Amino acid sequence: AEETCFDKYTGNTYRVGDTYERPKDSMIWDCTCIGAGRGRISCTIANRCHEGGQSYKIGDTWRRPHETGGYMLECVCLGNGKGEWTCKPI
């Protein structure tokens, strides 16, 4: 029988090597089923930004008012292993 990993957040089982997203609270984790006889799962946010209660992949963009409210910004998730982002007026 094929070995699996169980994810308590998605509520699903996965097979070894399977990759998936795990929503937990305001964040989305990139997870991989390893197994190792104990359903070992490795998850990472190293490649994501988490800002304004949303989750972004590298290069994803979002729109945000400038602090003054007079104009809209576009922000991009750069990541840099550190969840970094920047914005410019558009």
Curated annotation (Swiss-Prot):
Sulfated. It is found in: Secreted, Extracellular space, Extracellular matrix; Secreted. Residues 3-46, 47-90 form the Fibronectin type-I domain. It comes from the Eukaryota. Residues 31-50 are annotated as: Required for binding to LILRB4. Disulfide bonds join C5-C33, C31-C43, C49-C77, C75-C87. Expressed in the inner limiting membrane and around blood vessels in the retina (at protein level). Plasma FN (soluble dimeric form) is secreted by hepatocytes. Cellular FN (dimeric or cross-linked multimeric forms), made by fibroblasts, epithelial and other cell types, is deposited as fibrils in the extracellular matrix. Ugl-Y1, Ugl-Y2 and Ugl-Y3 are found in urine. It is linked to Glomerulopathy with fibronectin deposits 2: Genetically heterogeneous autosomal dominant disorder characterized clinically by proteinuria, microscopic hematuria, and hypertension that leads to end-stage renal failure in the second to fifth decade of life. Fibronectins bind cell surfaces and various compounds including collagen, fibrin, heparin, DNA, and actin. Fibronectins are involved in cell adhesion, cell motility, opsonization, wound healing, and maintenance of cell shape. Involved in osteoblast compaction through the fibronectin fibrillogenesis cell-mediated matrix assembly process, essential for osteoblast mineralization. Participates in the regulation of type I collagen deposition by osteoblasts. Acts as a ligand for the LILRB4 receptor, inhibiting FCGR1A/CD64-mediated monocyte activation. Secreted by contracting muscle, induces liver autophagy, a degradative pathway for nutrient mobilization and damage removal, and systemic insulin sensitization via hepatic ITGA5:ITGB1 integrin receptor signaling. Mostly heterodimers or multimers of alternatively spliced variants, connected by 2 disulfide bonds near the carboxyl ends; to a lesser extent homodimers. Interacts with FBLN1, AMBP, TNR, LGALS3BP and COL13A1. Interacts with FBLN7. Interacts with COMP. Interacts (via type III repeats 9-14) with TNFAIP6 (via CUB domain); this interaction enhances fibronectin fibril assembly. TNFAIP6 may act as a bridging molecule between FN1 and THBS1. Interacts with TNR; the interaction inhibits cell adhesion and neurite outgrowth. Interacts with FST3 and MYOC. Interacts with SVEP1. This is Fibronectin. It comes from Homo sapiens. The chain holds residues 93 to 182 of 2477 of the full protein.
